[model samples]
Target: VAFIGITTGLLSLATVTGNLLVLTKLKTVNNYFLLSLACADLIIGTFSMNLYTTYLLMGHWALGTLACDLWLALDYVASNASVMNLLLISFDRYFSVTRPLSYRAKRTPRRAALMIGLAWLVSFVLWAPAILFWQLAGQCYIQFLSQPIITFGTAMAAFYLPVTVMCTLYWRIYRFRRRGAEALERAFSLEDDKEALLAALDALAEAFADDAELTALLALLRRLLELAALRAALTRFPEFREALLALLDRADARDLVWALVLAIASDPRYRPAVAAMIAFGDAEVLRAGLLRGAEALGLPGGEALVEEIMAEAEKEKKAARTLSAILLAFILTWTPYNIMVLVSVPETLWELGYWLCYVNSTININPMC
Candidate 1:
């Protein structure tokens, strides 16, 4: 027992020295709480452990009454302070994870000092006076051991309550990190899938077959459907579109264009490609194929479907004109005010210019009204 006590005391002293070095070198907000915890442990090691060891070796309290009372008080305060410091550290970590921005905005050295001060103050208040005043005659032990209520109450406050709060905070922190990890993992998996899909598409585009021309044409159509932005870029590479059209011009591949158009026409992303195919391909063939394909797909009123689609295309043209007019009206209204502001107009006219900007709202409403 004596050997154990000596070995433990030396290790504790080493920790105290290490903590002292950290306190001197790193004056950070996080280190402040750590330093306070180290101080508590230091007191337990240097004062409490030494006195207890002396008692054990001598087999009695050789120290005077005052020494015993002070040792008991300091021991309780230090141990409780250690627990409180742990609680503070947990809360600090909790806020850093949950409310990083707002907490960091208010995380000053002064606030950290105040929190550390309060932790020590609570520990001292809870234990120091209670240990000093309450006595069991001349014995160097807890006076409240005989009273179950007092023992339970002190235990609840000093150990159980802080431990429960710390556990709850740590549990929440773990869940928060786990949620973030899952989202990051999902994002990486999606990226992997996208890469794999692109690789498969590239291989299909380059594959050779008995009818390589037909295979290439089908591959391009498949690519158009999968890649939304490729349809817009198809206009820039008109030679590729022309090459596909040339392939369709062959008698064997003539029906394939209709199949491709019908497959892609319903999707808005493929509308540009569909429009280019309609403009450049044989119109009479398209009209015949449209009727045949619509009938084959079990579409109702196949004869009227072509007329309805053509009418919808005309309506889209009118909608574009209306949009252009609205944009032109907006520019006519706001441009004057912007120019006036830039030129530093008279104050009276500046107010007029501001009100003029509001007229754009009336112009917008006038159409509905």
Candidate 2:
């Protein structure tokens, strides 16, 4: 009992400190749900454990009947609130990932407030019966609601319901991400070949350290790529192209000259039959930058390049929406004790369950990053 109390006490304090920032500093609907979960766990340590662990250590409930009722009431409210908040979080993730464009219209702060309000209301309804009615007949104290009512009400509403909802929502997100990966596979292949040649160009950039005429050629080529993305008109494009040709013609290295020529070649016809190879480690990112430039000028293949560029944006949005990593971490830390709540376990098992639930409040701190 001493071990459990000290551990849970520290965990609740830290969880509150970290998640309070989410509530106050970062204003988002999802962060609010996260904040509520942290608050729920915090009560287990501060409100419930302090009283309950005192009973455990002394081997008796010395605080009398009133404190017992208050402790039990708050325990039901906090635990129920935690389960409901997790369910609400799953619903938010479902829409954000699967319907990102439409999600913006429906994901309002007012709706978040309504859900949070509803969670506390339901939790209060479940536990209020025990607190409201008390009987002390025949010099024996008892709760008027009976133990059966409290036990089953919590089991069905909090545990069974939330587990069903979370599992269904996570499965749907998995399918959508898989389909997106399949769609993006081809455009990525094209960039891989271009990256092979860029690797060789990297060595040239390194070998010529001086910021002379030869170095200027490399700088102009990079700028041309930038200019292409910026929608530089016919004049700006031609000017950079002519400037590059002047520098490349005077250069001592033939392979270096060939690289610039192949990059600008309109079709396979004008492109050199066999261009020498060099490594450009940053090629994949550079191609993405240049493709946007081509897109702005209404180039012949701009439509296809536009598709490839937007694919990257889509992946970025998915990463933000996916909650798989955080969700897994939550389940591992919280499930053991949460499951223990639904069944009639021995005193030894109850001790284990109680300790684990509080420990998870500390593990919950990592997802903020």
Q: What is the lDDT of residue 184 in candidate 1?
A: 23
lDDT of 2 by residue, 1-56 (tens): 36666665666576656555544456667667777777777676567766655656
**Candidate 1, which segments miss by more than 4 Å at Cα?**
16-18, 135-138, 192-369
Worst 10 residues of 2 by lDDT: 271-280
TM-score of each: 0.49, 0.59
Lowest lDDT 10-residue stretch of candidate 1:
360-369
| lDDT score for residue 89 of model 1 | 71
- Model-by-model lDDT, in order? 0.51, 0.52
TM-score of 1: 0.49
lDDT of 1 by residue, 259-337 (tens): 3344434444334223322332244444566555455444533454465444544543443333334334545654565
